[PDB]
Coordinates of C-alpha atoms in Angstrom, one line a residue:
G18 CA -20.2 -47.1 127.5
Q19 CA -20.0 -45.4 130.9
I20 CA -22.4 -44.2 133.6
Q21 CA -22.0 -41.1 135.8
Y22 CA -24.0 -39.9 138.9
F23 CA -24.6 -36.4 140.4
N24 CA -26.6 -35.4 143.5
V25 CA -28.7 -32.2 143.0
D26 CA -28.5 -30.9 146.7
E27 CA -24.7 -31.6 147.0
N28 CA -23.4 -30.4 143.6
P29 CA -26.1 -27.8 142.6
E30 CA -23.9 -25.9 140.1
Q31 CA -22.9 -29.2 138.3
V32 CA -26.5 -30.3 137.8
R33 CA -27.5 -26.6 136.9
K34 CA -24.7 -26.7 134.2
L35 CA -25.7 -30.2 132.9
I36 CA -29.4 -29.1 132.4
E37 CA -28.3 -25.7 130.9
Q38 CA -25.8 -27.5 128.5
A39 CA -28.7 -29.8 127.5
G40 CA -30.6 -26.6 126.4
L41 CA -33.1 -26.8 129.4
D42 CA -33.9 -24.5 132.4
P43 CA -33.1 -26.2 135.8
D44 CA -35.1 -23.4 137.3
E45 CA -38.2 -24.8 135.4
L46 CA -37.1 -28.6 135.8
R47 CA -37.1 -28.0 139.7
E48 CA -40.3 -30.2 139.9
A49 CA -38.5 -33.3 138.5
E50 CA -37.4 -36.2 140.8
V51 CA -34.8 -37.8 138.4
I52 CA -33.2 -36.7 135.1
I53 CA -31.4 -39.2 132.8
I54 CA -29.1 -38.0 129.9
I55 CA -28.4 -40.5 127.1
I56 CA -25.6 -39.7 124.5
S57 CA -24.5 -42.2 121.8
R58 CA -22.4 -42.0 118.6
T59 CA -25.2 -43.5 116.4
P60 CA -28.9 -42.7 116.8
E61 CA -29.6 -46.5 116.6
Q62 CA -27.4 -47.2 119.6
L63 CA -29.0 -44.2 121.5
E64 CA -32.5 -45.5 120.7
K65 CA -31.6 -48.9 122.5
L66 CA -30.2 -47.0 125.6
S67 CA -33.2 -44.6 126.0
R68 CA -35.6 -47.5 125.8
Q69 CA -33.4 -49.4 128.4
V70 CA -33.7 -46.5 130.9
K71 CA -37.5 -46.1 130.0
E72 CA -38.1 -49.6 131.5
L73 CA -37.3 -48.2 135.0
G74 CA -39.9 -45.3 134.6
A75 CA -37.3 -42.5 134.9
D76 CA -39.1 -39.1 135.7
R77 CA -37.3 -37.0 132.9
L78 CA -35.3 -38.1 129.8
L79 CA -33.1 -36.2 127.3
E80 CA -31.4 -37.8 124.2
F81 CA -28.4 -36.6 122.1
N82 CA -26.3 -38.1 119.2
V83 CA -22.6 -37.4 118.5
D84 CA -23.0 -37.5 114.7
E85 CA -26.0 -35.1 114.6
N86 CA -24.9 -32.7 117.4
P87 CA -21.1 -33.3 118.1
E88 CA -20.9 -29.8 119.8
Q89 CA -23.7 -30.5 122.3
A90 CA -22.5 -34.1 123.0
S91 CA -19.0 -32.6 123.6
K92 CA -20.3 -29.8 125.9
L93 CA -22.2 -32.3 128.2
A94 CA -19.2 -34.8 128.2
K95 CA -16.9 -31.8 129.2
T96 CA -19.3 -30.9 132.0
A97 CA -19.2 -34.6 133.2
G98 CA -15.3 -34.4 133.2
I99 CA -15.1 -36.6 130.0
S100 CA -12.6 -35.9 127.2
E101 CA -13.6 -35.8 123.5
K102 CA -11.4 -38.9 123.1
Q103 CA -13.2 -40.7 125.9
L104 CA -16.7 -39.7 124.4
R105 CA -15.5 -41.3 121.1
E106 CA -14.0 -44.5 122.4
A107 CA -16.8 -45.3 125.0
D108 CA -19.6 -45.5 122.2
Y109 CA -22.1 -44.1 124.8
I110 CA -22.5 -42.0 127.9
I111 CA -25.2 -42.1 130.6
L112 CA -25.5 -39.2 133.2
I113 CA -28.0 -39.8 136.1
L114 CA -29.3 -36.8 138.2
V115 CA -30.7 -37.9 141.6
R116 CA -31.9 -36.5 145.1
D117 CA -29.9 -39.1 147.2
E118 CA -26.8 -41.4 146.8
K119 CA -28.7 -44.7 147.4
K120 CA -31.2 -43.8 144.6
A121 CA -28.3 -43.8 142.1
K122 CA -27.3 -47.4 143.2
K123 CA -31.0 -48.5 143.1
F124 CA -31.1 -47.5 139.4
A125 CA -27.5 -48.9 138.7
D126 CA -28.6 -52.3 140.2
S127 CA -30.9 -52.8 137.1
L128 CA -28.2 -51.7 134.6
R129 CA -25.6 -54.1 136.2
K130 CA -28.2 -57.0 136.0
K131 CA -29.0 -56.2 132.3
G132 CA -25.2 -56.1 131.5
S133 CA -22.9 -59.3 131.2
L134 CA -23.9 -63.0 131.0
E135 CA -25.5 -64.5 134.2
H136 CA -27.2 -67.9 135.0
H137 CA -25.5 -69.2 138.3
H138 CA -24.7 -66.1 140.5
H139 CA -21.5 -65.3 138.5
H140 CA -20.7 -61.8 140.1
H141 CA -21.9 -59.7 143.1

């Protein structure tokens, strides 16, 4: 899978379009601090990933599956600059909406620690 990051105050039209493509009103979601988007090709793989981001206490969550809603998964991938081929070969997509560039890395530091094998300070 892949992770993407967008800043609400610096790319307002990108975040507006991601929330509108998700079928939500960004004009109503204006009170949210963080929005996380999970898209996976099976609902079983999506249910792992949504629980994995829920451990961090993310302020808003939205979930889609490529087999149930291929058109909506494709629309959000297109908005993130991702091809329909890239959506298919990656198994899953994560899109993170944040108010600052360091807040994205603060969240990513958990995802990078959960990924790979570690026991003796292997990487970074």
